[PDB]
Amino acid sequence: SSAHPETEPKWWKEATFYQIYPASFKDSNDDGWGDMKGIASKLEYIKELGADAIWISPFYDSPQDDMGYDIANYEKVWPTYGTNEDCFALIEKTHKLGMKFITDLVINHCSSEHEWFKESRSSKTNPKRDWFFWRPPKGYDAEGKPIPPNNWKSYFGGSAWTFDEKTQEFYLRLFCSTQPDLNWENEDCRKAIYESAVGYWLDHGVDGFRIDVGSLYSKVVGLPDAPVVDKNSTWQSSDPYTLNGPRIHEFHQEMNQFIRNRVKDGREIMTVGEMQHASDETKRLYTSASRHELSELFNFSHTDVGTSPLFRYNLVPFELKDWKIALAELFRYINGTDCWSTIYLENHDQPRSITRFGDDSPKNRVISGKLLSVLLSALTGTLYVYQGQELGQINFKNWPVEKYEDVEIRNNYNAIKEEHGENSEEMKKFLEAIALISRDHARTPMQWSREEPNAGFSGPSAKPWFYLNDSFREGINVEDEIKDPNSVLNFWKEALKFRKAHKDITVYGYDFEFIDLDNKKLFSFTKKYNNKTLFAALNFSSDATDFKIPNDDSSFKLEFGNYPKKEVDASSRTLKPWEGRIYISE
**Which residue numbers are catalytic?**
212, 274
- CB of 40: closest distance to Ca ion in angstroms? 12
- CB of 31: closest distance to Ca ion in angstroms? 4
Residue 523, SS3 per DSSP? strand
CA 497 to chain centre: 23
CA distance 216 to 179: 13
- CB of 28: closest distance to Ca ion in angstroms? 6
Phi first, then psi: what are they for 524, rounded to 5°? -135, 145
- CB of 37: closest distance to Ca ion in angstroms? 8
87 vs 223 by CB, closer to Ca ion: 87
What one-character DSSP code corresponds to residue 575? E
What one-character DSSP code corresponds to residue 167? T
338 vs 451 by CB, closer to Ca ion: 451
- CB of 178: closest distance to Ca ion in angstroms? 23
- CB of 47: closest distance to Ca ion in angstroms? 22
31 vs 225 by CB, closer to Ca ion: 31
CA distance 431 to 452: 29
Are 486 and 565 within 8 A, CB to CB?
A: no
31 vs 546 by CB, closer to Ca ion: 31
Are 47 and 98 within 8 A, CB to CB?
A: yes
28 vs 244 by CB, closer to Ca ion: 28
82 vs 148 by CB, closer to Ca ion: 82
Cα of first residue to Cα of last residue in the chain, in angstroms, is 15
Are 234 and 108 within 8 A, CB to CB?
A: no
Are 97 and 45 within 8 A, CB to CB?
A: no
Pairing of strands 134-135, 169-172: antiparallel
27 vs 181 by CB, closer to Ca ion: 27
Are 537 and 528 within 8 A, CB to CB?
A: no
Residues that bind Ca ion (CB under 5 A): 27, 29, 31, 33, 35
- CB of 46: closest distance to Ca ion in angstroms? 18
CA distance 331 to 319: 20
Cβ neighbours for 66, distance < 8 A, ≥ 6 positions apart: 175, 176, 178, 179, 407
Residue 270, SS3 per DSSP? strand
Beta bridge partners of 342: 382
CA distance 372 to 356: 11
